[PDB]
């Protein structure tokens, strides 16, 4: 066990999907995994391990924000043999042409956190995903008839920002989605020598206030999970 | 309701105690509150409302890290009429004379987060608790015969810090405990116009491991909760 | 002697009250101290030692600005056995409800100086007063029937600031008074191992001019000095 | 014309290859392009436009360093309709497993320049390539029997850095090559809404030392240019 | 009058010499000026006006540190018609070849203060003297047979620095003397459209602990004052 | 030889003039030097060595931007015995009184580059010229009937700056010319113990607009080179 995960080596697969919401980890395990067992419940951060098309896969919540997800991803990598993290989450859009229910793949993640400056001698660390994992996710989405956008996320420390002006800056520089984790996960992956990827579905538009039907939103969420799971199978080959 | 709290105005008391762990909020509601009802379970972040000695009191987890607790404390302040937040958490000691299970009251909170620089035009915002709440907690602790040290916490973004030498700097400057929230809660309280206090118990020593037993953790946790609850009653006078 | 104080160990009491203006130190010695003797005049920075109600007390100017007061407070701590420093100064208000001649107690001090970043590895050091000294000043003020607000000061490097908009940010974050020393004194106290408190009277309003008379300044100055001196007597118990 | 390019709209292809050494532009034009014409000569920064397998391609040097290449890439994008920039350069390696003459593709670029902080309100902009361009280069290299590594470059402002220890940090965080341009090119591409990619060959191992032959270096340079040119054809699908 | 100078327009000459120590301003006026009158005594910061070889000249202390001298120099420029400030002070040496009693002229001043970053949008403002004033001082020193060194000063915020390492950095980059004011005076001069110069005598060596005779030190101090006064006469022609 | 200069010790004079445009080096050699010989050609950065009135002088371009000119000036100082660098370039003006074709001498250079913060532990290094070189240029200009302005340049990293408002700040603080090199050259000179000077002619007024003739621009360039060369002879006293 580690300070935030009451489990032993082998309880997790070498790939872990991670939503922010632990109740979504339970949702994913029940919906997509066969023979799924709960393997962590410390602090309510439910984690599960099962199989997808015979392949051992884990899913566990990471909580909200860079500090929370940095704890869980570190401990998985250093003590549970985890080689790949796929964050599966929601994000807010700032670009007009990025629509509700688009699937966004974060090849990079900008941030207003200081954690990577702390790692990188106060210089600019480009927080990036693993290229092969990005390619696997693009290819899995194509096989499913979903065309994902690949680009930069912005990982914010303040969901309730005082700086409304920063959203115009994100739009100017082409940020595809705003979430709260990717840059921290990518920093952990680089620090501890593992691989990570963040996929998000667009849940909100800071530009055009608008909302679709729940059935359509939930379909797209499941499409993101299918993309993540099928991308693992591609990487295995 | 708000994006992370499925409740309505009136469901929360005007004072909310907040551990990081939602399961500890459940324990506090079951152990210390009469007629406790669950008022939130979104993302598993359990929150409850009941009475302590006739006084309406709420307790809700805030998750780990400044970004997580900033979400919950903001929404409580802006949409649920919450006037006082008392974080009741754990922390790690860097000072040799600060012992396991000591109670620490954070009159100020240092941090390596950027959130207060974003608020404060990149200058030094001294993230401080409400003085009256600090005095109430000191007095409540004295009435219970519990020692309590008052001073600075350090709110870290990285539990697994790559900069071990910074602990020497914390120690040099008298930091009483390392946790991950106080400076963010104090920044939210100032931004959104409420009052806050962080109380912690020393759960680990960052230099010396110092293992504790389960029965000792519960006694000291209960002591911290008693201090917080009794401090509310003092402030009501 | 030290580079800026021509005195020897024992010439100062273990508590030193410090206005910015050396002429105010002379006035304090003449008005409040019995058997006062001058113990320093290097650079005209007048310092005196006498007794208040039998208690040995010193009073010495510290000059204007963090660099100036950091010199004097350091040398007092390291070479003259000084244990407590009480700055007794003036400040400018930014909050509409903070009135001229109000007494403000700086439990914390914000700043735009770099001195604490230099100390604290470029992170946020919360520059705080000693809690017991804060409580002593609150209690002494209550015993004298004088109102006193407790909260954050802002210690500015530029009295003539080129950034007028920053006063809106100070006001937003509840800053009670703008002065030029507290955050530096609190940083010295932490660095060199002593205790400090800043008390100020609102001498000007940064928005509204608000002129005062000479007799009102003296009464309120005397009130601040009485609070400081009586707070020492409370701390001795 | 623009301040640094004496040409008119249409004189450049929508894709420009850019070496750092201006002498390589004429070499690339004569060796790889058909029907090349001269389109710029100001400051000796010769530019040429021709075709590769029928596809219009331009080539022009960018000069050493982020400020130099930022000038040329901006003017090409805003006044010459350029949609894709491929930098073709050399880099130094810090990783033991990265060998001399290896081909490195910069999906991201770290930097110690301030240019992207100036752009991005002093936050962390992840300077990234266009994903399709990255994959095109990977696939073109594979078709040529060259395995390319994809990851982070580091774009240095100081070739002669006074901070040797930063190379250890680069190694820890997996930096594949050190050059002086990619992060600046990627920032320009994001600022003005275009696409860019940096491909480098390893010319030195910064912390070890060993050499190659002139014929080996020419073969490897030619390989890089073939990868770049064939990658464009793949992008045209 | 201004908040820190109780005088009226005309009471000061259009050139003011400024030592840090107000008792030194009295020393300079009595030693070098004819018909000298005291024109300020607020906060004990003595200022005087007299004639040197028939030329109207003022001398007034500026206190220790950038915040103190920034107050006095601003108020002189904006409200007393002062066109030129000459700081005349002491400094500590870090270079081996810079000796006790050398005269140093600060054509530039480095600093660890934040005041110029506040003025200059967090970029690097090169805090420089007025060229003509530098040339006048060099020429006056030559006429007196003193060969002054012209170069960079370092203006420190902390006389008692915690960062001993910075002195090696100053030596590496050729800093001639360490004092506490020049960069702030030069920032004020630029902000308010006036001219300034700092001259110092070397009073201490952070390298070679050593001291000369008082008679020789005082001779060199008077040489610095003569250089400053004669340089004004050169500028007048 | 060095990585960017294929020459040996003695091939360069101890004084090197450096334009930004590499084509100007050959022009300066043919127009002003006697007996010139070619001493470098790598990357097309032609260097020449000859004599001016019997005095050995070299000329070689430095490329655009701080990183480019930092490479060449470092290698000249550390491997070719170069003692003085004179940059001879153009700049844009922000002050209304600074006219097209004015000669500006940069006694200091502000910057938005990070290179000197990297050198100087993130403090403010005042990037300054050598004083004697400044005065030599002023005196040589006066002997040629040219009045030169001496003050601060601003060395920009982005010719195409996204922050137009910074030009207002430059104007307020008296910046004479905007170019892209001086602060970097001055930092190298300080780092490696040599001397440097930047002279520029005003080629544009950034916030207004108007033009000159080709013959006027050639006359003004020739004037600048004559000033530079005659200033060297004055320095040799
Ligand atoms: N040495 C330590 N360091 C950082 N945080 C903590 C904590 C607290 O517990 C959580 C991490 O375990 C987090 O919410 C933090 O506030 N306990 N001990 C800690
Ligand atoms: N509006 C104001 N702003 C900044 N400082 C002060 C002060 C205090 O008085 C001095 C400046 O007049 C200085 O020591 C500072 O602490 N009073 N009013 C102030």
């Amino acid at each position: 066990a580690t300070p935030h995960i009451n489990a032993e080596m082998g309880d997790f697969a070498d790939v872990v999907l991670m939503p922010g919401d632990p109740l979504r980890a339970k949702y994913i395990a029940e919906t997509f995994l066969e023979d799924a067992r709960e393997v962590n419940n410390v602090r309510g951060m439910l984690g599960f391990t099962g199989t997808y098309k015979g392949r051992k896969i884990s899913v566990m919540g990471h909580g909200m924000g860079i500090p929370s997800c940095s704890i869980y991803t570190k401990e998985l990598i250093t003590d549970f043999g985890v080689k790949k993290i796929i964050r599966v989450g929601s994000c807010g859009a700032v670009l007009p042409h990025v629509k509700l229910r688009d699937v966004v793949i974060g090849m990079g993640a900008c941030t207003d956190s200081k954690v990577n400056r702390i790692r990188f001698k106060d210089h600019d660390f480009a927080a990036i995903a693993d290229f092969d994992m990005v390619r696997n996710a693009v290819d899995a989405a194509k096989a499913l008839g979903i065309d994902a956008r690949v680009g930069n996320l912005f990982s914010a420390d303040l969901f309730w920002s005082p700086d409304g002006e920063m959203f115009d800056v994100m739009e100017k520089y082409g940020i595809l989605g705003v979430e709260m984790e990717a840059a921290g996960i990518y920093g952990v992956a680089a620090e501890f020598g593992a691989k990570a990827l963040t996929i998000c579905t667009v849940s909100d538009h800071i530009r055009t206030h608008e909302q679709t039907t729940a059935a359509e939103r939930q379909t797209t969420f499941n499409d993101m999970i299918k993309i993540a799971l099928e991308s693992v199978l591609l990487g295995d080959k």
Side-chain angles (χ1 to χ4, degrees), chain A:
Chain A
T2 59
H4 306 89
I5 308 180
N6 184 22
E8 298 308 318
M9 175 70 81
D11 285 353
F12 291 90
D14 68 359
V15 181
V16 187
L17 274 64
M18 303 192 88
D21 178 1
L23 301 186
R24 275 304 163 184
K26 182 167 174 30
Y27 171 87
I28 292 165
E30 188 72 14
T31 302
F32 294 99
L33 301 186
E34 296 280 324
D35 308 322
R37 63 200 219 91
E38 186 180 292
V39 300
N40 181 60
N41 57 15
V42 172
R43 294 175 176 261
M45 198 57 72
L46 307 179
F48 305 84
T49 299
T51 59
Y52 181 77
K53 300 186 177 180
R55 212 276 193 208
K56 190 181 175 189
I57 298 209
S58 295
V59 56
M60 178 170 156
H62 61 52
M64 293 187 298
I66 280 167
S68 178
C69 70
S70 296
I71 280 165
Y72 291 110
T73 54
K74 183 275 182 190
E75 289 176 28
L76 289 170
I77 291 159
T78 62
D79 288 79
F80 294 94
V82 174
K83 307 281 196 179
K84 292 180 170 184
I85 304 289
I86 304 179
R87 164 168 153 69
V88 284
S90 61
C91 66
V94 294
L95 287 168
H97 53 97
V98 174
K99 308 308 193 57
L100 298 177
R101 304 195 305 133
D102 286 357
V103 175
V104 169
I105 301 174
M107 64 183 293
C110 309
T111 186
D112 54 12
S113 170
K114 233 169 77 165
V115 295
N116 289 334
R117 290 192 193 178
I118 287 171
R119 292 179 169 108
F120 212 59
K121 292 203 61 173
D122 201 38
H123 296 134
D124 286 18
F125 177 73
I128 57 169
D130 176 80
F131 165 77
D132 288 335
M133 291 182 73
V134 175
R135 183 173 48 177
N136 295 336
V138 166
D139 290 348
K142 184 188 179 178
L144 294 165
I146 299 130
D147 216 288
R149 311 167 172 280
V150 185
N152 254 337
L153 296 166
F154 182 98
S155 302
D157 265 1
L158 292 175
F159 182 97
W160 298 105
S161 180
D163 181 9
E165 170 39 23
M166 195 54 205
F167 296 115
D168 289 327
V169 180
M170 298 180 207
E171 179 178 4
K172 176 172 183 183
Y173 284 91
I175 274 55
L176 298 182
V178 183
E179 46 80 68
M180 296 180 66
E181 288 89 9
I185 297 171
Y186 296 167
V188 163
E191 181 178 356
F192 294 97
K195 299 167 176 184
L197 176 70
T198 298
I199 310 169
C200 290
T201 62
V202 175
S203 287
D204 189 27
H205 219 305
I206 301 131
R207 265 285 194 138
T208 295
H209 298 345
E210 178 207 6
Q211 214 52 226
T212 167
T213 71
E216 289 169 310
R217 291 196 308 273
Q218 300 166 15
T219 302
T220 296
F221 183 89
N222 289 353
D223 279 332
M224 163 177 66
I225 307 302
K226 287 187 57 29
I227 287 159
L229 294 167
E230 294 289 340
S231 81
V232 174
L233 302 185
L234 252 22
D236 289 337
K237 302 193 296 193

